[PDB]
Design a protein around this ligand. Structure first.
Ligand code: HEM
Ligand SMILES: O=N[O-]
Ligand SMILES: O=N[O-]
Length: 153
């Protein structure tokens, strides 16, 4: 897992997210859907949207983006001791919405991209390596729970 210094840096840049959680959610999802259009098919509410303008206009998309990033900052703040928080997320993403592990990789890349673009002074080379490892840990722990739940992610 991560050292103390690594966790510090993950929690530092995460504070800059908290200051506008919705706006970050929107940019995350738009980056995800534009880079990887097949992920958009997973969201029944707004899978019919075609353009970035439509995606910025959607109130549904904005709310969904806020929920993901809020659930993720909860997990990161546990600095790896996130079993309790990870359980419900694993369950819903393995049963209700079947999210392959690969799509969790894509959204990790989207988050890393938005952080780099919006907060470069809080997100240099070391902090990016730290967030990369923290999001690997998250995906790896989720994959372990997929297996028990009977979803081949
Ligand atoms: C950082 C990774 C992610 C986190 C922390 C996360 C968290 C959440 C949470 C908290 C919810 C609402 C409650 C629930 O259903 O459990 C949710 C819903 C959802 N997630 Fe995820 N999620 C992640 C990644 C993804 C990815 C990559 C996809 C699809 C490509 C996805 C698809 C969905 C869908 C379809 C819903 C239902 C959306 C709705 O209310 O319209 N998730 N997510
Ligand atoms: O809705 N979570 O990407
Ligand atoms: O969105 N990943 O570059």
């Amino acid at each position: 897992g991560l050292s103390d210094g690594e966790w510090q840096q993950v929690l530092n840049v995460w504070g800059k997210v908290e200051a506008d959680i919705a706006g970050h959610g929107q940019e995350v999802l738009i980056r995800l859907f534009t880079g990887h259009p097949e992920t958009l098919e997973k969201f029944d509410k707004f899978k019919h949207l075609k353009t970035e303008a439509e995606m910025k206009a959607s109130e549904d998309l904005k709310k969904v983006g806020t929920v993901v990033l809020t659930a993720l900052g909860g997990i990161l703040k546990k600095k790896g001791h996130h079993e309790a928080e990870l359980k419900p997320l694993a369950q819903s993403h393995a049963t209700k919405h079947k999210i392959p592990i690969k799509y969790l990789e894509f959204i990790s890349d989207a988050i890393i991209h938005v952080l780099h673009s919006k907060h470069p002074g809080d997100f240099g080379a070391d902090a990016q390596g730290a967030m990369t490892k923290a999001l690997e840990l998250f995906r790896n722990d989720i994959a372990a729970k997929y297996k028990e739940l009977g979803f081949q992610g």
